[PDB]
Write a protein that holds these residues in place. Structure first.
Motif, PDB file in Angstrom:
ATOM      1  N   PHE A 129       0.826  -1.202   0.000  1.00 27.72           N
ATOM      2  CA  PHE A 129       0.000   0.000   0.000  1.00 27.72           C
ATOM      3  C   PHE A 129       0.863   1.256   0.000  1.00 27.72           C
ATOM      4  CE2 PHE A 129      -1.549   3.452   2.629  1.00 27.72           C
ATOM      5  CZ  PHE A 129      -2.748   3.789   2.032  1.00 27.72           C
ATOM      6  N   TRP A 130       1.761   1.372   0.982  1.00 29.42           N
ATOM      7  CA  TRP A 130       2.477   2.628   1.186  1.00 29.42           C
ATOM      8  C   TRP A 130       3.400   2.951   0.019  1.00 29.42           C
ATOM      9  CZ3 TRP A 130       1.271   6.617   3.646  1.00 29.42           C
ATOM     10  CH2 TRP A 130       0.556   6.549   4.847  1.00 29.42           C
ATOM     11  N   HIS A 131       4.051   1.940  -0.557  1.00 30.97           N
ATOM     12  CA  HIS A 131       4.898   2.192  -1.719  1.00 30.97           C
ATOM     13  C   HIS A 131       4.069   2.671  -2.904  1.00 30.97           C
ATOM     14  CE1 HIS A 131       8.179  -0.705  -0.003  1.00 30.97           C
ATOM     15  NE2 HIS A 131       8.185   0.480   0.581  1.00 30.97           N
ATOM     16  N   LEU A 132       2.877   2.099  -3.090  1.00 29.29           N
ATOM     17  CA  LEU A 132       1.968   2.609  -4.111  1.00 29.29           C
ATOM     18  C   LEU A 132       1.477   4.007  -3.752  1.00 29.29           C
ATOM     19  CD1 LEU A 132      -0.099  -0.627  -4.799  1.00 29.29           C
ATOM     20  CD2 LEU A 132       1.503   0.465  -6.380  1.00 29.29           C
ATOM     21  N   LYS A 133       0.972   4.177  -2.526  1.00 26.84           N
ATOM     22  CA  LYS A 133       0.482   5.482  -2.091  1.00 26.84           C
ATOM     23  C   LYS A 133       1.561   6.553  -2.194  1.00 26.84           C
ATOM     24  CE  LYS A 133      -2.450   8.222   0.266  1.00 26.84           C
ATOM     25  NZ  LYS A 133      -1.648   9.397   0.707  1.00 26.84           N
ATOM     26  N   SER A 134       2.822   6.186  -1.963  1.00 28.74           N
ATOM     27  CA  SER A 134       3.901   7.165  -1.955  1.00 28.74           C
ATOM     28  C   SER A 134       4.161   7.780  -3.325  1.00 28.74           C
ATOM     29  CB  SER A 134       5.188   6.520  -1.436  1.00 28.74           C
ATOM     30  OG  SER A 134       5.720   5.608  -2.382  1.00 28.74           O
ATOM     31  N   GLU A 135       3.593   7.222  -4.397  1.00 29.83           N
ATOM     32  CA  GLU A 135       3.809   7.733  -5.747  1.00 29.83           C
ATOM     33  C   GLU A 135       2.502   8.123  -6.431  1.00 29.83           C
ATOM     34  OE1 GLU A 135       7.178   6.290  -7.965  1.00 29.83           O
ATOM     35  OE2 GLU A 135       7.196   4.437  -6.786  1.00 29.83           O
ATOM     36  N   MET A 136       1.433   8.326  -5.658  1.00 28.70           N
ATOM     37  CA  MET A 136       0.166   8.760  -6.240  1.00 28.70           C
ATOM     38  C   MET A 136       0.321  10.085  -6.978  1.00 28.70           C
ATOM     39  SD  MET A 136      -2.816   7.061  -5.935  1.00 28.70           S
ATOM     40  CE  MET A 136      -1.919   5.793  -6.807  1.00 28.70           C
ATOM     41  N   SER A 145       9.291   6.264   2.427  1.00 30.65           N
ATOM     42  CA  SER A 145       8.680   7.412   1.777  1.00 30.65           C
ATOM     43  C   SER A 145       7.176   7.196   1.699  1.00 30.65           C
ATOM     44  CB  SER A 145       9.254   7.617   0.376  1.00 30.65           C
ATOM     45  OG  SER A 145       8.532   8.622  -0.315  1.00 30.65           O
ATOM     46  N   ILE A 146       6.413   8.202   2.121  1.00 31.76           N
ATOM     47  CA  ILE A 146       4.957   8.150   2.081  1.00 31.76           C
ATOM     48  C   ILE A 146       4.377   9.094   1.045  1.00 31.76           C
ATOM     49  CG2 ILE A 146       4.895   7.451   4.495  1.00 31.76           C
ATOM     50  CD1 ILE A 146       4.039  10.247   5.235  1.00 31.76           C
ATOM     51  N   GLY A 147       5.217   9.787   0.283  1.00 32.62           N
ATOM     52  CA  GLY A 147       4.719  10.730  -0.700  1.00 32.62           C
ATOM     53  C   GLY A 147       5.862  11.497  -1.337  1.00 32.62           C
ATOM     54  N   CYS A 157       8.598  13.765  -1.449  1.00 33.66           N
ATOM     55  CA  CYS A 157       9.550  14.361  -0.514  1.00 33.66           C
ATOM     56  C   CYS A 157       8.951  14.460   0.889  1.00 33.66           C
ATOM     57  CB  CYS A 157      10.011  15.733  -1.013  1.00 33.66           C
ATOM     58  SG  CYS A 157      10.849  15.692  -2.612  1.00 33.66           S
ATOM     59  N   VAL A 158       8.609  13.296   1.435  1.00 33.41           N
ATOM     60  CA  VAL A 158       8.086  13.202   2.793  1.00 33.41           C
ATOM     61  C   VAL A 158       8.096  11.739   3.215  1.00 33.41           C
ATOM     62  CG1 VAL A 158       5.724  13.118   1.922  1.00 33.41           C
ATOM     63  CG2 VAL A 158       6.152  13.703   4.326  1.00 33.41           C
ATOM     64  N   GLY A 159       8.476  11.478   4.459  1.00 29.90           N
ATOM     65  CA  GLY A 159       8.504  10.112   4.940  1.00 29.90           C
ATOM     66  C   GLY A 159       9.042  10.040   6.351  1.00 29.90           C
ATOM     67  N   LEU A 160       9.367   8.817   6.760  1.00 28.70           N
ATOM     68  CA  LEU A 160       9.747   8.513   8.129  1.00 28.70           C
ATOM     69  C   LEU A 160      11.120   7.858   8.165  1.00 28.70           C
ATOM     70  CD1 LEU A 160       6.264   7.106   9.088  1.00 28.70           C
ATOM     71  CD2 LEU A 160       7.216   9.307   9.809  1.00 28.70           C
ATOM     72  N   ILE A 161      11.865   8.154   9.228  1.00 28.47           N
ATOM     73  CA  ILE A 161      13.203   7.619   9.438  1.00 28.47           C
ATOM     74  C   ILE A 161      13.305   7.156  10.883  1.00 28.47           C
ATOM     75  CG2 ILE A 161      15.674   8.048   9.323  1.00 28.47           C
ATOM     76  CD1 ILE A 161      15.059  10.331   7.353  1.00 28.47           C
ATOM     77  N   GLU A 162      13.754   5.919  11.078  1.00 27.45           N
ATOM     78  CA  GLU A 162      13.883   5.378  12.423  1.00 27.45           C
ATOM     79  C   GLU A 162      15.060   6.027  13.139  1.00 27.45           C
ATOM     80  OE1 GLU A 162      14.364   1.172  12.531  1.00 27.45           O
ATOM     81  OE2 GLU A 162      14.543   1.076  14.718  1.00 27.45           O
ATOM     82  N   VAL A 163      14.833   6.445  14.378  1.00 28.80           N
ATOM     83  CA  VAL A 163      15.910   6.952  15.218  1.00 28.80           C
ATOM     84  C   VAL A 163      16.667   5.772  15.807  1.00 28.80           C
ATOM     85  CG1 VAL A 163      16.457   8.231  17.310  1.00 28.80           C
ATOM     86  CG2 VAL A 163      14.724   9.108  15.728  1.00 28.80           C
TER      87      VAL A 163
END
Ligand SMILES: CNC(=O)c1cc(NC(=O)c2cc(F)cc(C(F)(F)F)c2)c2c(c1)C(=O)N[C@H]2c1ccccc1C
Lengths: 270, 1008
Positions: free
Chosen positions: B634-641, B806-808, B810-816
């Motif tokens: 889902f998220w990889h698809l959603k990340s390139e909508m 990446s969720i979109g 130039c936006v996403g999450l990075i684990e600390v």
């Protein structure tokens, strides 16, 4: 009549580099390297045929050369020029061209004082990084304007669905209030006719506000959609110039290559 | 897709006016609350409507609903009357009262899909294209396959879908792991709750590492009934009781041991052995697990059910021609540019089936050609996957310098549509912008399809109308044509045929070799690894050869997934080839390796010629039977909508997934809304208060995060980096903006696990809006592959492929990484030795202070191992020359690089960072540290690692190749990938590559 001194031998070159040189050339253009194996006496011939860059290995045995098992020619230049007079259909009918148009190591240039590098290369390179910064800037606000346009294109389409909903409100206000106004008219109830009108006038008063807000956006759109197309034709005008002087900067390294060492490019490093 | 609760407004005031349009033409202004649910509105409207004319006409409140226009320009029927006013994403604050029409449940479900995939579902209903309407309908059977398959043995099969076993792909643990097992056994602790206070108790066990979970449950009840004087059959009676009444869970997260894999094959315990840590498990009631698995129906949608002579390609005894009529909306400066023209080529993948042809050149002011382009190919010779690639090009002339050509816009067309009919009649397609950095006149890798954006260059063509509809031959005639043309062992040969198999996917395959393979094409099925090479050798512009080739692939031996993935990249578009590649995956690609390579497998969906293909149905099938891969699917698809080239293909694909992923859609939507709130706050910080100070921003942040509607949205949901991590309450105490210009958010949640203390008590992640993260994703993924290869060869080189997603755009999450610092930070914990020169030993000393005692040798080993790992990796990938602030090290001693996107950008000299500080540590603070025996075996770790990757160089070159159509500027042509061939030295033998890397290592220590 020697190999290292030919036109079409470049030798120590990457496959990607010869791909860049045969890009969109006509059938029969050709170029020779030493095989990417970097192996001595073992060579590769690329030629253009059928839109493709096609790779021929050139064999080496008992001092003779060729590019199949029965191996004939004394040198590689005897091998190549034999196929410059007549077709390599002799080798394989599947490719029927001659080695028509060589791409030459030299035969490409642009008094050769050292200033030609230290002064006129640094000049062309400075001229190349400025126009590359402009085109990066253009492509930045090009993509920015491209998004602020579609943002507006949907918002006016929202206004389109809103105005549709209000216009059908008007056409149902007139539908279900005609024969109550007509009934109130003959009961002399002007007090109730004006409530329906005071509300109808307030209905088409607001619809006038959102219609005005729609055009005020179609205007900001019209004027940004145009300044968008201008940014496009500016990029398209900057792209060819940018390529032209990027190559100039590159082949002005040739006289650094005639000096034979990149000492003076590293002087430009530091 | 919604910057705020109203158009141009972030939040509604506590009270706002709303225009209410009744079914009578009266308009009522209702003062309501930002949160006022629609039931509160509908009631208080019909209560105020009695103050306005023509109340008599209104039916009862309960017989009406609201409709309004969203910021997505959808006329949305608000069936879900439980929503708050401010959550509607209203465009303007008004509501139109209407009678509800259509299936309520369906409409409510579509609104929820629309929020998930990020676009209104009803935009699909309006699509003229029948490929879209056929796709929507004809993949609903891949969904029924999956729902029925997972609702089969309820509730276990329903649990196996939501909490699938997280397993390594093989139980054969390599020896260096087993050497941390006490005489082939493992020690494990099982925890239990005692409910009156949720007190807790634990039972330590020593067991064979290959015990199945039920066997673990046996050795625990066996240890607690030690003193119960039970008979061998009474023991069986309560072992059976617990084997079937309980299951095991990982303490601190949602991982369960629901299937009888051997215990050490579960990833959590494979690493507890590798890391020598204690596997903490919680025994849990199965009836408590199935309680949190709410039954979820799957209902066929409306479009699913209803809708309101030909000749073969191979009869057409004529060559191919295509008419170019004219262009539109061409943005060119009429005087800087002399003329324009259309360039075309007929492409099978990336090989021109025939030489290109152009229109004649034409002035800018009149882009019209009306020109038939003739091609050197037979219409019968067209392969099924043939494609027309075209572009508009400008020219600028000069004599003292060469004439320059540049592409203005591009477009690609499938000569055969998804019904394998050959196109005909006049056609018109809008063109795409040329990607940044591309200068090739054409773009054969770009997606086929017209640009939906308006006022874009629109080109018109005509394809010959042959006297009837034309279809591609059915497979029957193709094979018997191979039998027609086929009528028209060896040693060294076979030696070289297999000597070809060794060479990597990009190796130079000279003419003599490809037609040598075509000759021995039948002897090739003995070395099935060769299949990709033989395919590039087929002259695809010959129906004779292609036909003969379909026969060989129809009977081809299954190659393994690492090889089958190449045949899904862009150089293998033939539907028979790709079908064979998919069948290899769905029978040999584990759900683990599928999850591993999911990025690439999603990415190659862009190359698929048509929406409905064997690949997408395999990924979607697996995505709905395994909610772990379905999550990132889902998220990889959603990340390139946002990319309109694929927004349709991916959107139709997400619609299906969301319509059948069950009760998980609800969880995903909570993730999406949580991200939406975060992106709308970072957009505010970056666009509005960018000029404000860094403490002013801090106060808007904490106060905005103080708001209840925010915390109720940002607390209590699943971490998109790993849905197994629940994210509970925020620790606003710890949240912050960060020093970067894009000011990413450092976000820190409590971990709500009943036994959270046994894993990590609070979990923190970085949210960055404005940076392209998918280079970090691919780099971190690739690092995870290389760590996986080394471990299986026995190289215990510990990398740190921290979570990145990446969720979109130039936006996403990075684990600390907890308890970690940069090398620049650690030099700053030291002192200046030389003349304004940091102390080189400072790293070694800080590591000593953090590892006093017998643990000092362990940290040096970990550093020297992880260092060797990242040294080799960063050189191979060209990530070598990193700043001290982009290299990090834990208090643990584990070294790892970060911020890979920052490096690639900064690009536009040293093989890899092997600084002196590292040599102090590696050699344990010695003099001439390059001559000791710690360094002697350190560079022996680097060497063994480099050739360990070259021994798998095929896998990586294929993974990158699959990413070309992604649009990452680092991956625009196979020329880009040529760098890895140079670092791995694939055109040289092993010993030459070894000596190449050795010279780079002597230069990497800056002299030696
Ligand atoms: C001093 N450095 C260089 O000179 C250099 C470096 C690189 N490295 C990358 O671009 C790269 C590395 C990643 F780990 C991930 C990514 C991605 F995709 F996330 F952006 C990009 C490359 C080249 C040259 C080149 O020519 N091609 C590149 C390349 C090399 C090796 C593998 C793949 C690629 C694309």
């Amino acid at each position: 009549m020697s190999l290292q001194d030919a036109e079409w031998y470049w030798g120590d070159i990457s496959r990607e580099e010869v791909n860049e040189k045969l890009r969109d050339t006509a059938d029969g253009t050709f170029l020779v390297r030493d095989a990417s194996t970097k192996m001595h006496g073992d060579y590769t011939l690329t030629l253009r045929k059928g839109g493709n860059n096609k790779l021929i290995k050139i064999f080496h045995r008992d001092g003779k050369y060729g590019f199949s098992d029965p191996l004939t020619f004394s040198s590689v230049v005897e091998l190549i020029n034999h196929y410059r007079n007549e077709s390599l259909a002799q080798y394989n009918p599947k490719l029927d061209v001659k080695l028509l148009y060589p791409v030459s190591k030299y035969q490409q240039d642009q008094e050769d004082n050292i200033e030609a590098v230290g002064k006129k290369l640094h000049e062309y390179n400075t001229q190349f990084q400025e126009k590359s910064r402009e085109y990066d800037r253009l492509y930045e606000e090009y993509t920015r304007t491209s998004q602020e346009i579609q943002m507006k294109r949907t918002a006016i389409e929202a206004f389109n669905e809103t105005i549709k909903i209000f216009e059908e409100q008007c056409q149902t206000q007139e539908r279900y209030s005609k024969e109550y106004i007509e009934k109130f008219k003959r009961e002399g109830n002007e007090k109730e006719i004006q409530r329906i009108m005071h509300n109808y006038d307030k209905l088409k008063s607001r619809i006038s506000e959102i219609i005005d807000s729609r055009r005020r956006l179609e205007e900001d759109l019209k004027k940004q959609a145009a300044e968008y197309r201008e940014i496009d034709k500016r990029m398209n005008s900057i792209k060819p110039d940018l390529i032209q002087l990027r190559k100039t900067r590159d082949q002005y390294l040739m006289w650094l290559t005639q000096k034979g060492v990149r000492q003076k490019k590293l002087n430009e490093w530091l | 897709p919604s910057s705020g609760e109203l158009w141009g407004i972030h939040l509604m005031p506590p009270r706002i006016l709303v225009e209410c349009l009744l079914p009578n033409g009266m308009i009522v202004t209702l003062e309501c609350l930002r949160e006022a649910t629609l039931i509160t509105i509908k009631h208080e409207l019909f209560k105020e409507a009695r103050k306005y004319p023509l109340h008599q006409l209104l039916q009862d409140e309960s017989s009406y609903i609201f409709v309004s226009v969203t910021q997505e320009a959808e006329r949305e029927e608000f069936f879900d009357e439980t929503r708050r006013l401010c959550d509607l994403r209203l465009f303007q604050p008004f509501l139109k009262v209407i009678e509800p029409v259509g299936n309520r449940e369906e409409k409510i479900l579509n609104r929820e899909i629309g929020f998930a995939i990020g676009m209104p579902v009803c935009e699909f209903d309006m699509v003229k294209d029948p490929e879209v309407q056929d796709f929507r309908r004809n993949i609903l059977n891949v969904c029924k396959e999956a729902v029925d398959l997972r609702d089969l043995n309820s509730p276990h099969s329903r649990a196996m879908y939501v909490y699938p076993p997280n397993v390594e792909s093989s139980p054969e643990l390599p020896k260096h792991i087993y050497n941390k097992l006490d005489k082939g056994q493992i020690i494990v602790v099982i925890w239990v709750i005692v409910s009156p206070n949720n007190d807790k108790q634990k039972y330590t066990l020593k067991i064979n590492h290959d015990c199945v979970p039920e066997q673990v449950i046996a050795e625990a009840i066996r240890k607690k009934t030690r003193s119960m004087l039970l008979s061998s059959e009474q023991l069986k009676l309560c072992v059976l009781e617990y084997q079937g009444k309980y299951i095991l869970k990982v303490c601190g997260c949602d991982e369960y041991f629901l299937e009888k894999y051997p215990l050490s094959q579960y990833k959590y315990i494979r690493s507890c052995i590798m890391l020598g840590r204690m596997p903490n498990l919680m025994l849990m009631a199965k009836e408590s697990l199935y309680s949190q698995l709410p039954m979820d129906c799957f209902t066929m949608p409306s479009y699913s059910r209803r809708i309101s002579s030909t000749k073969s390609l191979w009869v057409i005894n004529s060559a191919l021609r295509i008419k170019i009529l004219c262009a539109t909306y061409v943005n060119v400066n009429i005087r800087d540019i002399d003329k324009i023209y259309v360039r075309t080529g007929i492409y099978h993948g990336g090989e021109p089936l025939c030489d290109n042809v152009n229109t004649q050149r034409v002035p800018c002011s009149n882009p019209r050609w009306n020109e038939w382009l003739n091609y050197d190919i037979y219409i019968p010779d067209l392969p099924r996957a043939a494609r027309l690639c075209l572009s508009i090009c400008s020219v600028k002339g000069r004599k003292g310098a060469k004439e320059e050509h540049c592409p203005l816009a591009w477009g690609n067309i499938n000569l055969f549509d998804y019904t394998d009919t050959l196109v005909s009649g006049k056609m018109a397609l809008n063109l795409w912008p040329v990607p940044h950095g591309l200068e090739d006149l054409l773009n054969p890798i770009g997606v086929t399809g017209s640009n939906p954006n308006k006022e874009t260059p629109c080109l018109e063509l005509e394809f010959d109308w042959f006297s009837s509809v034309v279809k591609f031959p059915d497979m029957s005639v193709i094979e018997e044509h191979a039998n027609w043309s086929v009528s028209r062992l060896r040693e060294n040969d076979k030696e070289q045929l297999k000597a070809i198999s060794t060479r990597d996917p990009l190796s130079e395959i000279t003419e003599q070799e490809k037609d040598f393979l075509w000759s021995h094409r039948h002897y090739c099925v003995t070395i099935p690894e060769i299949l990709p090479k033989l395919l590039l050798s087929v002259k695809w512009n010959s129906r004779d050869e292609v036909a003969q080739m379909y026969c060989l692939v129809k009977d081809w031996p299954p190659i393994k997934p690492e090889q089958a993935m190449e045949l899904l990249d862009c150089n293998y578009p033939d539907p028979m080839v790709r079908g064979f590649a998919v069948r290899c995956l769905e029978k040999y690609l584990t759900d683990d390796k599928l999850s591993q390579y999911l990025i690439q497998l999603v990415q190659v969906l862009k190359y698929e010629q048509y929406l409905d293909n064997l690949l997408v149905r395999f990924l979607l099938k697996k995505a709905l039977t395994n909610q772990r891969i379905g999550h990132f699917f889902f998220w990889h698809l959603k990340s390139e909508m946002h990319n309109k080239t694929v927004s349709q293909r991916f959107g139709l694909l997400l619609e299906s997934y969301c319509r059948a992923c069950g009760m998980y859609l609800k969880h995903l939507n909570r993730q999406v809304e949580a991200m939406e709130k975060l992106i709308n706050l970072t957009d505010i910080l970056k666009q509005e208060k960018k000029d404000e100070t860094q403490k002013v921003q801090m106060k808007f942040l904490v106060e905005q995060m103080r708001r209840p509607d925010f915390m109720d949205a940002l607390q209590g949901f699943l971490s998109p980096l790993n849905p197994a991590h629940q994210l509970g309450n925020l620790r606003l105490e710890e949240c912050r903006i960060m020093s970067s210009a894009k000011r990413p958010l450092w976000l820190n949640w409590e971990n709500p696990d009943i036994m959270s203390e046994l894993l990590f008590q609070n979990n923190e992640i970085i949210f960055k809006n404005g940076d392209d993260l998918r280079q970090d994703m691919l780099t971190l993924q690739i690092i995870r592959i290389m760590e996986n290869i080394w471990q299986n060869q026995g190289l215990d080189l510990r990398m740190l492929p921290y979570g990145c997603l990446s969720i979109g755009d130039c936006v996403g999450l990075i684990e600390v990484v907890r308890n970690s610092h940069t090398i620049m930070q650690i030099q700053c914990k030291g002192g200046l030795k030389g003349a304004l020169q940091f102390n080189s030993h400072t790293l070694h000393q800080w590591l000593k202070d953090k590892n006093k005692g017998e643990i000092y040798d362990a940290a040096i080993d970990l550093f020297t191992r992880s260092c060797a790992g990242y040294c080799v990796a960063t050189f191979i990938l060209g990530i070598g020359d990193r700043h001290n602030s982009n290299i990090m090290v834990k208090d643990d001693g584990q070294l790892f690089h970060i911020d890979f996107g920052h490096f690639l950008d900064h690009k536009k000299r040293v093989p890899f960072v092997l600084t002196q500080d590292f040599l102090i540590v590696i050699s344990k603070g010695a003099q001439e540290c390059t001559k000791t025996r710690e360094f002697e075996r350190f560079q022996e770790m680097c060497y063994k690692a480099y050739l360990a990757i070259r021994q798998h160089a095929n896998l990586f070159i294929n993974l990158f190749s699959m990413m070309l159509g992604s649009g990452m500027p680092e991956l625009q042509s196979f020329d880009d990938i040529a760098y890895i061939r140079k670092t791995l030295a694939l055109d040289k033998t092993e010993q030459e590559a070894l000596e190449y890397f050795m010279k780079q290592m002597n230069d990497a220590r800056h002299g030696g």
